[PDB]
Amino acid sequence: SEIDKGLAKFGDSLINFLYSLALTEFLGKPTGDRVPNASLAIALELTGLSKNLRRVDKHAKGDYAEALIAKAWLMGLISEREAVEIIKKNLYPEVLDFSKKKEAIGRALAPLLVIISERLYSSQV
Amino acid sequence: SEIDKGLAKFGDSLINFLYSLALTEFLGKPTGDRVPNASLAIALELTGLSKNLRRVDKHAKGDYAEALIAKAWLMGLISEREAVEIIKKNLYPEVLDFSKKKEAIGRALAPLLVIISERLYSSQV
Hints:
Two copies of one chain form a homodimer.
Chain A: H1 5-27, H2 37-47, H3 61-74, H4 80-88, H5 101-121
C-alpha cells in the first residue's frame, strides 16, 4: 500500500474542518457536514489521480486523498485560507441536497487535489 | 446558553482538527481521531458548566460544549495554536486505549472549556 494510515487520519480531520469552514462562509452562517468517503473517491477519479493507485489501494481511494491533503499541509505547501477559497468557489446549492451531496462535494474537492498534487511534485529538487 | 445545531456541527469539525493536531505532536507522528459526543459531555460536567442547561437539555451537553468552542474561535477569542497547547498539556496515554479513551478525552478537553467559558463571559458577558 502507498497509504500511510496516520496521514489519512490527520487528513480526515483537516478536510472536514476546511469543508465546514467553506460551507459556513458559502451559506453565511455557521454549519458543518462530514465529508463522505465517496466524495473523496469521486474527486480522486475525476482528477485522474486514481489511475496511479495499485490494486491493494483501489478500495481506499478516500484514504489516499486524505493522506495526500495531510502531506501537503504538514509540509506547508498549502494554507487553510487558500484551501477554503478553492473549495468555496466550486460549491453549489446541491450541497444542501442529500440526494446529490456526494457528487457535489466530490466536484468541489477535485480542484483542490489537483493543486495539492502539483505542488508536492514541484517541491522535489 | 442556546444550543444551535449548526454551530455545534461547525464546532465538531473544528475540535476534531485541533484535537488531531494535539494528538500528532503528543505522539510525535501524523495521526488523528474524532472526539466522541460522550467525551464532550463528560468535559462539560467536569467543569460544572452543565449546570446552566436544563435536565432535558442533557442529550445536548456534547453539542453545547462544541458550540461554545466554535463561538469562541469564531469571535476571535482564542487561536488554533493556543487551543492545541491547552489540549496537549492535558493529554494522557489512556487516550490511546479504546476502553478508557472516552473519559480520557473528556479530561483533556475540560481545561479548554474552562478557559473558553471564562473568555466568553469576561468579554461578551
